[PDB]
mmCIF file with all atom_site columns, N, CA and C in Angstrom:
data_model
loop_
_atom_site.group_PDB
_atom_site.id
_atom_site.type_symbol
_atom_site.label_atom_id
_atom_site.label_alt_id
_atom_site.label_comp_id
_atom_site.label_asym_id
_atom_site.label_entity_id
_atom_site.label_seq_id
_atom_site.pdbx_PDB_ins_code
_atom_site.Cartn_x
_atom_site.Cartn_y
_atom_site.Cartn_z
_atom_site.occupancy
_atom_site.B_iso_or_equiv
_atom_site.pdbx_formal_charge
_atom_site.auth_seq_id
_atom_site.auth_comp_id
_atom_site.auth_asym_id
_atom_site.auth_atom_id
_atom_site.pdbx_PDB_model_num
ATOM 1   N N  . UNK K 1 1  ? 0.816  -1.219 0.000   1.00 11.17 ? 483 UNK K N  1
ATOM 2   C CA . UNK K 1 1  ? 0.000  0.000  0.000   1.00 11.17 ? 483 UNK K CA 1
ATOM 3   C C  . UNK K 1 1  ? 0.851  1.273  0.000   1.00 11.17 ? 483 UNK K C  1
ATOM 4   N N  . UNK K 1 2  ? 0.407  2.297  0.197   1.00 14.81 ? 484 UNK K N  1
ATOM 5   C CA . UNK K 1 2  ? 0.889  3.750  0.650   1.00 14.81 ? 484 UNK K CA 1
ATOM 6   C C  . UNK K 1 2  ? 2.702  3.736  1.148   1.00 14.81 ? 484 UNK K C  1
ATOM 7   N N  . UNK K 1 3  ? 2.173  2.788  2.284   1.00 14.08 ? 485 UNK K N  1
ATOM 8   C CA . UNK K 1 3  ? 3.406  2.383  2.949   1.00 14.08 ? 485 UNK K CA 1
ATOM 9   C C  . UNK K 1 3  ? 4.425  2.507  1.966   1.00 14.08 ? 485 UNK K C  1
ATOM 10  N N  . UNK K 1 4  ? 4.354  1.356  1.494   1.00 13.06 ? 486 UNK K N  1
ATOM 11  C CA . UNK K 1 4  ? 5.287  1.006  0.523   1.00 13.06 ? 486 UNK K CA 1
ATOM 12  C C  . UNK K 1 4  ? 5.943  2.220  -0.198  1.00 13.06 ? 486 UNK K C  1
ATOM 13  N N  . UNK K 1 5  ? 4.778  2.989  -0.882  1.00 15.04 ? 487 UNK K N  1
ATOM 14  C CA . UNK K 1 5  ? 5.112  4.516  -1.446  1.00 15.04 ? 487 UNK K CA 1
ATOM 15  C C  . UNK K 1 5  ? 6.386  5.076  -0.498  1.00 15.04 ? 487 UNK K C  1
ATOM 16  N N  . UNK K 1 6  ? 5.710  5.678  0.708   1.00 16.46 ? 488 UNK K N  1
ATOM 17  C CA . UNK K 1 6  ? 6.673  5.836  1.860   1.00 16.46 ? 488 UNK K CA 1
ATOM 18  C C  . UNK K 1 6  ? 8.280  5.619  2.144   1.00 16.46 ? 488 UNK K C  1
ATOM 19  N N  . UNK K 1 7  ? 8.352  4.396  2.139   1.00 16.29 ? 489 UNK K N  1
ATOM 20  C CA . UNK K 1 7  ? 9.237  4.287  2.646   1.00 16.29 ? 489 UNK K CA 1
ATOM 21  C C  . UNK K 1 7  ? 10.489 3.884  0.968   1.00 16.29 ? 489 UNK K C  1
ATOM 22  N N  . UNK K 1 8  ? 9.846  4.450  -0.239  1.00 16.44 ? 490 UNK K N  1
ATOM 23  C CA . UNK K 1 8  ? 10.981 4.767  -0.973  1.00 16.44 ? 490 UNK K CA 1
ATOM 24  C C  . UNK K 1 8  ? 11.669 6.481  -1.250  1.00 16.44 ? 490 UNK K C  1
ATOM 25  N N  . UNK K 1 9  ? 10.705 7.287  -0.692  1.00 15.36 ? 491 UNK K N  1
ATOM 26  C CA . UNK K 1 9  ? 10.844 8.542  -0.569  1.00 15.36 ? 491 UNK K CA 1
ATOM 27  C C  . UNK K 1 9  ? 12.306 8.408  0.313   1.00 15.36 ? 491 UNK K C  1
ATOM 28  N N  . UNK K 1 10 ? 11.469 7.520  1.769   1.00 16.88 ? 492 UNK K N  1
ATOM 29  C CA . UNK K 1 10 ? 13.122 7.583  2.834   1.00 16.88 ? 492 UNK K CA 1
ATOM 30  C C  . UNK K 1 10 ? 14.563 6.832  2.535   1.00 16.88 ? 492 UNK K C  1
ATOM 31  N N  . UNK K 1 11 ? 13.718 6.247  1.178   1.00 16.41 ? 493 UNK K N  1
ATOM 32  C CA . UNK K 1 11 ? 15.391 5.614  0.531   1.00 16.41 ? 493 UNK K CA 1
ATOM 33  C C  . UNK K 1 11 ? 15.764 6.979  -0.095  1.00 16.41 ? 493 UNK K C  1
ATOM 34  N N  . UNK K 1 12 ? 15.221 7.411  -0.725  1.00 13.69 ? 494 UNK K N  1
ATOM 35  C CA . UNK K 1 12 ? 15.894 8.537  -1.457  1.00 13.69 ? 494 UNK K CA 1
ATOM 36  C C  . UNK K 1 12 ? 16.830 9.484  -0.515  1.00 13.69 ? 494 UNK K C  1
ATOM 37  N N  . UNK K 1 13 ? 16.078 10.203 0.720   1.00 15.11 ? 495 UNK K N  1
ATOM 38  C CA . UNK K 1 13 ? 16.959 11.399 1.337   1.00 15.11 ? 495 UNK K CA 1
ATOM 39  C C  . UNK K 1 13 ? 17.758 10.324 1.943   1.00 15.11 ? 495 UNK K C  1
ATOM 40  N N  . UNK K 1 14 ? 18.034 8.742  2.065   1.00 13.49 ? 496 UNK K N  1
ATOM 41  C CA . UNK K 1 14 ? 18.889 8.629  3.013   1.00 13.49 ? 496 UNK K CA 1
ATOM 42  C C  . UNK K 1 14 ? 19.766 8.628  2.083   1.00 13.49 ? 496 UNK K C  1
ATOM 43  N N  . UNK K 1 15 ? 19.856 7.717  1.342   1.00 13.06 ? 497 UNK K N  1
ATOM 44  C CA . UNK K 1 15 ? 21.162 7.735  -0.119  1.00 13.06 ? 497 UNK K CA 1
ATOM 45  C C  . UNK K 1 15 ? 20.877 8.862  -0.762  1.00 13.06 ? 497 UNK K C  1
ATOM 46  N N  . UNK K 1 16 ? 20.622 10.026 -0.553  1.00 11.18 ? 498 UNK K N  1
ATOM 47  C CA . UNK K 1 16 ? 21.268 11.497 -0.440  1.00 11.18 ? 498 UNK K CA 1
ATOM 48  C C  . UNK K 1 16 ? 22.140 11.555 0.664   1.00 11.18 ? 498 UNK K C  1
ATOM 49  N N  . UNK K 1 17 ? 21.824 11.610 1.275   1.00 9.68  ? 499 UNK K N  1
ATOM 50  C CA . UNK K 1 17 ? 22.719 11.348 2.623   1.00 9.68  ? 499 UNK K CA 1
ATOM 51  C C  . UNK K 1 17 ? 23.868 11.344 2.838   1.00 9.68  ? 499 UNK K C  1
ATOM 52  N N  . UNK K 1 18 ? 23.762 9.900  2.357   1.00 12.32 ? 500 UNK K N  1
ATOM 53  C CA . UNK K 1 18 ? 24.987 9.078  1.947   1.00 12.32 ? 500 UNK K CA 1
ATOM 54  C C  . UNK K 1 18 ? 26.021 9.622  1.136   1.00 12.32 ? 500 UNK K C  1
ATOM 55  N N  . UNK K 1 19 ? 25.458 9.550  -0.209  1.00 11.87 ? 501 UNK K N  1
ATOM 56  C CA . UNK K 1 19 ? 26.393 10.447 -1.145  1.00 11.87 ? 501 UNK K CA 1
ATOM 57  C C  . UNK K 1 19 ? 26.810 11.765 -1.144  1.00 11.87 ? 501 UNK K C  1
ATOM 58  N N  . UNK K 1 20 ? 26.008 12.100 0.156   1.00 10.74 ? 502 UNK K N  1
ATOM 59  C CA . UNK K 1 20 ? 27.408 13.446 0.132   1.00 10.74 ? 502 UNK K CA 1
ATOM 60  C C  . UNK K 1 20 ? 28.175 13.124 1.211   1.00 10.74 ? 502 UNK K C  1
ATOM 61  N N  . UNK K 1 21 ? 27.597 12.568 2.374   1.00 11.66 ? 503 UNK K N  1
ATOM 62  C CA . UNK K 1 21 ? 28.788 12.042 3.078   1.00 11.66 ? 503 UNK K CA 1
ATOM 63  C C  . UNK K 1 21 ? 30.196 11.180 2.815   1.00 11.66 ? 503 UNK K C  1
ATOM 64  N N  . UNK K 1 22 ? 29.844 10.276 1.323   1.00 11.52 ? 504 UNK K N  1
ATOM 65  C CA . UNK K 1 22 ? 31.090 9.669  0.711   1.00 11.52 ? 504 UNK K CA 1
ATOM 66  C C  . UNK K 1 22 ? 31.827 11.145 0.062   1.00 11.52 ? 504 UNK K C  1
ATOM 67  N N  . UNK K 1 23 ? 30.929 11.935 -0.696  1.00 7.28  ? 505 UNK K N  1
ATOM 68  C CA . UNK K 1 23 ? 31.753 13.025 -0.984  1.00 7.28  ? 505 UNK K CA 1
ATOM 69  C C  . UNK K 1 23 ? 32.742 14.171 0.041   1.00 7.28  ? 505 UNK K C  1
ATOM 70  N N  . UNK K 1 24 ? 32.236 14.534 1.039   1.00 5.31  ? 506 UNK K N  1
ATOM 71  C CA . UNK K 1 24 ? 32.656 14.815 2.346   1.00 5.31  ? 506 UNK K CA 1
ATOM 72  C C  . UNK K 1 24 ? 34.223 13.931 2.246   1.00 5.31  ? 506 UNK K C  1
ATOM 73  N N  . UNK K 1 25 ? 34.001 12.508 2.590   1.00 2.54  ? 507 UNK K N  1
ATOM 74  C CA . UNK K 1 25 ? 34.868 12.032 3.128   1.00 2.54  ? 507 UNK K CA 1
ATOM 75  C C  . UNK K 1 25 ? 35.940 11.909 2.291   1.00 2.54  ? 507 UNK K C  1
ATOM 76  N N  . UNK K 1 26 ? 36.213 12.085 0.677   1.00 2.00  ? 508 UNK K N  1
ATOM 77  C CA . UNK K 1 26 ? 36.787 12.287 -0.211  1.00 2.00  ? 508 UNK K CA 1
ATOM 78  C C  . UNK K 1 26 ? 37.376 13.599 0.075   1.00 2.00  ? 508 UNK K C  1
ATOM 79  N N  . UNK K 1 27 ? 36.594 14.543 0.209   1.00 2.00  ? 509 UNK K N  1
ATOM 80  C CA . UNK K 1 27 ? 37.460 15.534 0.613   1.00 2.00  ? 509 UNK K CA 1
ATOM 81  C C  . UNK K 1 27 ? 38.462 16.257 1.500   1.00 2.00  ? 509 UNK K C  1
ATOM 82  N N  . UNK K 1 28 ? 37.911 15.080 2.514   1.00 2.00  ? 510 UNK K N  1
ATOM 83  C CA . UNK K 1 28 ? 38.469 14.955 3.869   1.00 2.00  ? 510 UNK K CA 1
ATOM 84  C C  . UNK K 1 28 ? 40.144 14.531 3.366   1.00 2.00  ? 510 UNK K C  1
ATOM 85  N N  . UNK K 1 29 ? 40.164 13.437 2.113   1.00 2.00  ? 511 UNK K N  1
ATOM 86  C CA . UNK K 1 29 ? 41.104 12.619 1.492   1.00 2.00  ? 511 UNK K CA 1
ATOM 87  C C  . UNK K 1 29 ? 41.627 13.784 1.232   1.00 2.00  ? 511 UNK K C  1
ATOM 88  N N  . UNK V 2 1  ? -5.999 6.299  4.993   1.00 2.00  ? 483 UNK V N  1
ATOM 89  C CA . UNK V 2 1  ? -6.039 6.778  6.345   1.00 2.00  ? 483 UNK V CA 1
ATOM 90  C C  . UNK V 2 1  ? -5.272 8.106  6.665   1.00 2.00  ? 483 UNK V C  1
ATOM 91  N N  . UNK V 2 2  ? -4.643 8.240  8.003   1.00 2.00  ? 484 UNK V N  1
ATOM 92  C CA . UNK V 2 2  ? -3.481 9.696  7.905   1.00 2.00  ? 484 UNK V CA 1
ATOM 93  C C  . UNK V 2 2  ? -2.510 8.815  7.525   1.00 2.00  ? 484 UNK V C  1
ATOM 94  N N  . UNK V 2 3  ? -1.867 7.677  7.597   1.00 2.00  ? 485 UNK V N  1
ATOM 95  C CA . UNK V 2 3  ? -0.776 7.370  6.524   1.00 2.00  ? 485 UNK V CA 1
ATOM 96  C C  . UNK V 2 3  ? -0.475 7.742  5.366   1.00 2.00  ? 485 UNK V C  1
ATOM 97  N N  . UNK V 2 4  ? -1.807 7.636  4.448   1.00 2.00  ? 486 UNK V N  1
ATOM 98  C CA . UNK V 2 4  ? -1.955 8.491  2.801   1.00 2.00  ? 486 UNK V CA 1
ATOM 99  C C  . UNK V 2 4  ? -1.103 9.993  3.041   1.00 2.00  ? 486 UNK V C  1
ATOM 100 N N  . UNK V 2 5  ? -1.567 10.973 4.470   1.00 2.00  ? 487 UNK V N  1
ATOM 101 C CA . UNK V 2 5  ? -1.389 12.131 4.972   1.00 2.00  ? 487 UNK V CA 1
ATOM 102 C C  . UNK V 2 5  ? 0.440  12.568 4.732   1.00 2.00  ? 487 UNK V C  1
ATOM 103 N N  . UNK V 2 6  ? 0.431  11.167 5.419   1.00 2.00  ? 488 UNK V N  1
ATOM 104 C CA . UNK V 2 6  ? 1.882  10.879 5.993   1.00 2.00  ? 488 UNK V CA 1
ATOM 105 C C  . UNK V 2 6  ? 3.144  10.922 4.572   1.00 2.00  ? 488 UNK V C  1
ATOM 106 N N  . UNK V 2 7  ? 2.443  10.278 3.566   1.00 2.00  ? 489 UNK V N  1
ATOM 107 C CA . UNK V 2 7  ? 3.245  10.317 2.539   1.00 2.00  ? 489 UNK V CA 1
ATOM 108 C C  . UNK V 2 7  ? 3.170  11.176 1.689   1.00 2.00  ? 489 UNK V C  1
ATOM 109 N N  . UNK V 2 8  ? 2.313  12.331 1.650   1.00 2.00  ? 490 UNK V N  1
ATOM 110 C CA . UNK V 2 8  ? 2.455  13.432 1.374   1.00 2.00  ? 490 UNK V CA 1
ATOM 111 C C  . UNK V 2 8  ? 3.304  14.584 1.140   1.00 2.00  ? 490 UNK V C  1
ATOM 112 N N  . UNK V 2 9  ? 3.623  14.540 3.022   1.00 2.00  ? 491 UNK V N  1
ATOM 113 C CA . UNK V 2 9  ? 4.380  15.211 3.302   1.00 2.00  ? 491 UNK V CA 1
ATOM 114 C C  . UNK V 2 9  ? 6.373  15.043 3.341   1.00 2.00  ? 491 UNK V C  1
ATOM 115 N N  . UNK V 2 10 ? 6.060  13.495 3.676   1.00 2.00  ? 492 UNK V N  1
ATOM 116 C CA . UNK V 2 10 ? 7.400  12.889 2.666   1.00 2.00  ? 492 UNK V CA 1
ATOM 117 C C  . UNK V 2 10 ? 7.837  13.337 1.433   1.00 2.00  ? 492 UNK V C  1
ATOM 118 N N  . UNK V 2 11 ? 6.473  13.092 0.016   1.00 2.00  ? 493 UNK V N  1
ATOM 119 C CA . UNK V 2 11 ? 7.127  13.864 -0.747  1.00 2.00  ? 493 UNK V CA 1
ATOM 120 C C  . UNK V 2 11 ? 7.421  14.672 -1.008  1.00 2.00  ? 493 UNK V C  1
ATOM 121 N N  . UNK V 2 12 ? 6.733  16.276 -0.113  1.00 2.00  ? 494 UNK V N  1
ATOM 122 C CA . UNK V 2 12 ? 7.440  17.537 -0.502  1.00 2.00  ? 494 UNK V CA 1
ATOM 123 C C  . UNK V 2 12 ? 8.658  17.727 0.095   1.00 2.00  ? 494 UNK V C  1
ATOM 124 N N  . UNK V 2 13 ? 9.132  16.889 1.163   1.00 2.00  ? 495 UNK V N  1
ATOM 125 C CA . UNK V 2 13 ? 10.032 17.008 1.708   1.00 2.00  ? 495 UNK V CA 1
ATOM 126 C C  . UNK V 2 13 ? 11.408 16.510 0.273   1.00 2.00  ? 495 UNK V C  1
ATOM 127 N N  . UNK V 2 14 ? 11.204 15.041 0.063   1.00 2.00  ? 496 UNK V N  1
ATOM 128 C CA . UNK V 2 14 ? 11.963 14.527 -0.746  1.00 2.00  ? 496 UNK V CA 1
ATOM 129 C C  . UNK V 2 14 ? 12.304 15.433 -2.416  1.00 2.00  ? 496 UNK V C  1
ATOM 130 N N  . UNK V 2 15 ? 10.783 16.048 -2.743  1.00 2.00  ? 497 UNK V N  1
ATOM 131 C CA . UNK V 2 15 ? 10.961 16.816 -4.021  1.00 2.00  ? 497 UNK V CA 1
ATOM 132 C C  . UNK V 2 15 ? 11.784 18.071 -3.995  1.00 2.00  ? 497 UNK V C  1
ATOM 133 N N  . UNK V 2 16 ? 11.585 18.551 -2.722  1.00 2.00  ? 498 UNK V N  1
ATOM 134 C CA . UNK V 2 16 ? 12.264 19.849 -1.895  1.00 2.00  ? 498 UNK V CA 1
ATOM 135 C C  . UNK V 2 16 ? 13.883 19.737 -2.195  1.00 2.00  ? 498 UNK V C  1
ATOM 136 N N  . UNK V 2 17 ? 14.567 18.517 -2.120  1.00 2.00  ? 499 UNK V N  1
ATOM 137 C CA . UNK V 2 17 ? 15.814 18.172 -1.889  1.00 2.00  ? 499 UNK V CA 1
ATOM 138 C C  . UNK V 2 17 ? 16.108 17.678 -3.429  1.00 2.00  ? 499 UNK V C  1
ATOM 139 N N  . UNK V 2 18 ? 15.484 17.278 -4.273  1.00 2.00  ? 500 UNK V N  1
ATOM 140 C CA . UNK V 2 18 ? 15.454 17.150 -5.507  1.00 2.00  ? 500 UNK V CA 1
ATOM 141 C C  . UNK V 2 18 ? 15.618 18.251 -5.894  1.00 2.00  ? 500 UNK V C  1
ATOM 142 N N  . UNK V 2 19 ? 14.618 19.481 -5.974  1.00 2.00  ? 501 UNK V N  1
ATOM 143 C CA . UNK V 2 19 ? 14.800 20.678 -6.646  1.00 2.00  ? 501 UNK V CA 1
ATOM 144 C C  . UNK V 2 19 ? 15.856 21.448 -6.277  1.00 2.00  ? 501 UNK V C  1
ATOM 145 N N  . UNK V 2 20 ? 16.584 21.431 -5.063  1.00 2.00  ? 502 UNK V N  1
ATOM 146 C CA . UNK V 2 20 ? 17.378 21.917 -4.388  1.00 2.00  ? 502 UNK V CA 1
ATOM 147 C C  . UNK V 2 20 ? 18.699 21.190 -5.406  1.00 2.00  ? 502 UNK V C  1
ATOM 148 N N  . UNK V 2 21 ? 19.069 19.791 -5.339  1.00 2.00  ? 503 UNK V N  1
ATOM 149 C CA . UNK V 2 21 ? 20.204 19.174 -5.877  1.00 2.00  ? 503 UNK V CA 1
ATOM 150 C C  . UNK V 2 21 ? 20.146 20.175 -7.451  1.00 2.00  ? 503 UNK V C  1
ATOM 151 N N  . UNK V 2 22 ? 18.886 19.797 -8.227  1.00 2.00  ? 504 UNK V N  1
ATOM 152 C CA . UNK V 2 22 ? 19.002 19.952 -9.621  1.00 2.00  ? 504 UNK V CA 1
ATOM 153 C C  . UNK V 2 22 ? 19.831 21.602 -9.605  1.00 2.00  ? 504 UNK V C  1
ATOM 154 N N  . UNK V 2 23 ? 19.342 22.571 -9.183  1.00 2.00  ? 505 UNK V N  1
ATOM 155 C CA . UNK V 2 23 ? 20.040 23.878 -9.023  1.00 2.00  ? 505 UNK V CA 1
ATOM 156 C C  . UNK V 2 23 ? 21.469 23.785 -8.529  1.00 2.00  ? 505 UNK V C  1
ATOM 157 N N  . UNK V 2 24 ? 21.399 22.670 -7.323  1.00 2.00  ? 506 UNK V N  1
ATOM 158 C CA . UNK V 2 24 ? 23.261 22.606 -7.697  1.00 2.00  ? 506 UNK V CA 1
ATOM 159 C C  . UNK V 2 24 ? 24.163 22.166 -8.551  1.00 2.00  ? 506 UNK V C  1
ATOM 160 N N  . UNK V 2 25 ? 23.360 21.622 -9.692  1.00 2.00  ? 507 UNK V N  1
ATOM 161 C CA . UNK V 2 25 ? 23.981 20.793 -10.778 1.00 2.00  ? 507 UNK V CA 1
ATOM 162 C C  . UNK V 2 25 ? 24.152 22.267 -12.250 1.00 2.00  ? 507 UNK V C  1
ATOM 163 N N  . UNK V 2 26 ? 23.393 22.575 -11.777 1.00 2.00  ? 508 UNK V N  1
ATOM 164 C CA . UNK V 2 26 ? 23.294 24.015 -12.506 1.00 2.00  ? 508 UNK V CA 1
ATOM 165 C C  . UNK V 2 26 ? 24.547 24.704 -12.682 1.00 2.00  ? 508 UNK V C  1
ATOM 166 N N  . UNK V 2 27 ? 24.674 24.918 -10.914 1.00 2.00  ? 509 UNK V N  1
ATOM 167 C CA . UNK V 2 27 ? 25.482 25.908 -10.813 1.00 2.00  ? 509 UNK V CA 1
ATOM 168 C C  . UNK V 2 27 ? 26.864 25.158 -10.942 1.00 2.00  ? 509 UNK V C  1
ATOM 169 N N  . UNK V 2 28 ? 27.093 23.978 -10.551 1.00 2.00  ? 510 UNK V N  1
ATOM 170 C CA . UNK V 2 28 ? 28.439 23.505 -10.928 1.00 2.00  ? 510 UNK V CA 1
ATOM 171 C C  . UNK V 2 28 ? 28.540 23.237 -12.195 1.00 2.00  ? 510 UNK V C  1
ATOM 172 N N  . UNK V 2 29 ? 27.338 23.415 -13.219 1.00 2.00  ? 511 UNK V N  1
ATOM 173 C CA . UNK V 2 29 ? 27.843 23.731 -14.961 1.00 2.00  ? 511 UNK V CA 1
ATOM 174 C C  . UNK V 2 29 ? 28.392 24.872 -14.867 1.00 2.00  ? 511 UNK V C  1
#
């Protein structure tokens, strides 16, 4: 259902997240 | 139910951060 809808939205901002935190940490490099 | 409610507001949140990225892709052209 809906749910389902849901909880790919929270995939999205988390692997946003993510990918700037790998970018971050590259820069950190 | 308010779940339907619930994912709503997920997506303006998620589209929010979408429209936000696309303008940074902009500006790093």
């Amino acid at each position: 259902p809906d749910l389902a809808k849901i909880l790919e939205e929270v995939r999205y901002i988390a692997n946003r997240f993510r990918c700037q935190d790998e970018s971050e940490a590259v820069c950190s490099e």
